[PDB]
Ligand binder design. Structure first.
Ligand SMILES: CSC[C@H]1O[C@@H](n2cnc3c(N)ncnc32)[C@H](O)[C@@H]1O
Ligand SMILES: CSC[C@H]1O[C@@H](n2cnc3c(N)ncnc32)[C@H](O)[C@@H]1O
Ligand SMILES: [Cl-]
Ligand SMILES: [Cl-]
Lengths: 226, 226
């Protein structure tokens, strides 16, 4: 566990249960009944709940757990992941963190992933024994303190521009590099922490594209048989 | 349109409406009513319809349109895609092909993607004018004939092993390389066509991982500013 590994954090992620402010908003009471589930237990999904986000703070960019799903499928199925060179974390917009054991097999299917997140939020850890997924209250800085990396990079379209190849080379110079990607569809980080801002392209990309650029460029430096 | 572009085909994809053999299987009649939609119009989804696949031919690996969703999000949001160096196609297990205009913005959300596929299957082309998506009856060989590539690679765990970096270099030697990835969760291709079998790793990976390895390795050779 002192070999070189990438520590990847999907941060300020739009992954949360229905906000308390809107639990009795019409579109929420009817979704909830239709699914025969208590509205507070349900994961906010902007696709279904769009008419209830209008007056919510930051409503336009909330309830996007699809971003997390696709980022996690990309990361957990990576060659980098199978070679024991990745640790991945989710930090949510409400300052909770989800820890993920490397061997975790996320549902490929979005609605099963949703099901699984509802369980994780309810019980704090899934499954009961393994705690392959484990959630707790935590800020981004508190998480970074635990990881105790030797460098922190923050992926930002407006940071120092790098060729992805070259960013992979750069990450391979550290022992315990941490890379942070926003889990939100647009705008800026909410959680300002210390680190180097890196752009991989001079237009905005989606989080999972960035996850891929970083993971694949790092594989080719760090996996010795490559 | 005679610059170097990758032509990527997700093939024998498990993307189809409910099979005629099971349209009046219980789990299908009740799903269908619950959604107030005619069962033949609905996309087969093994997550919901698992009890109806038991006796279907190949039932175990059918109704996996999530694989296509995640492969297409990876491909269409790629840097390679934004640089006009990618054309992507879906070939389904029933010998239909979906053509995709580069500028297409797939729903990030799985259930909207499903919605969109139901429309595409019904009308043959979406939206009415743009035909950003367009479907028609076609075998894999018929599709390859149209593309008229100068080389065809078939991604196979048991093919000639290559370092992804090196496979990118290889693809960059051709004008119009075609790469084929299976859109099925396990097993072999159904559609045997002529081409070079390439493994990128000596264990089985998921289609979207392979899509990423290929697309990212090609970007770094073919985009000159990289
Ligand atoms: C708002 S898009 C989601 C996240 O993707 C990352 N991102 C988006 N575009 C780029 C880019 N061009 N370079 C680097 N990171 C990016 C950032 O970490 C952002 O929070
Ligand atoms: C059955 S997994 C889906 C598809 O992924 C591709 N694939 C899976 N594992 C590998 C691998 N190790 N190397 C190359 N292609 C692979 C093949 O094209 C397959 O049809
Ligand atoms: Cl090492
Ligand atoms: Cl060119």
């Amino acid at each position: 566990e002192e070999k070189k590994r990438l520590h990847l954090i999907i941060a300020d992620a739009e992954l949360e249960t229905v906000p308390p402010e809107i639990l009795d908003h019409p579109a929420i009471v009817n979704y909830a009944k239709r699914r025969k589930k208590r509205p507070e237990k349900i994961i906010l999904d902007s696709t279904y709940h769009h008419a209830a986000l209008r007056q919510l703070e930051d409503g336009e960019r909330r309830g996007r757990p699809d971003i997390v799903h696709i980022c996690l499928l990309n990361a957990l199925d990576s060659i980098l992941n199978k070679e024991d060179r990745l640790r991945v974390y989710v930090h949510t917009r409400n300052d909770y963190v989800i820890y993920i054991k490397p061997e975790t097999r996320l549902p490929r299917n979005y609605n099963r992933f949703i099901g699984l997140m509802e369980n994780l939020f309810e019980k704090g850890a899934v499954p009961e024994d393994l705690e392959l997924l484990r959630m707790e209250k935590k800020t981004l800085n508190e998480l970074i303190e635990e990881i105790n990396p030797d460098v922190v990079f923050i992926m930002h379209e407006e940071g120092e521009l790098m060729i992805p190849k070259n960013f992979g080379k750069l990450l391979d110079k550290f022992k315990k590099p941490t890379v942070i990607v926003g889990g939100f569809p647009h705008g800026d980080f909410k959680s300002k922490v210390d680190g180097v801002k890196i752009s991989l392209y001079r237009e905005p990309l989606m989080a999972w594209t960035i996850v891929n650029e970083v993971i694949v460029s790092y594989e080719w430096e760090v996996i010795k048989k490559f």
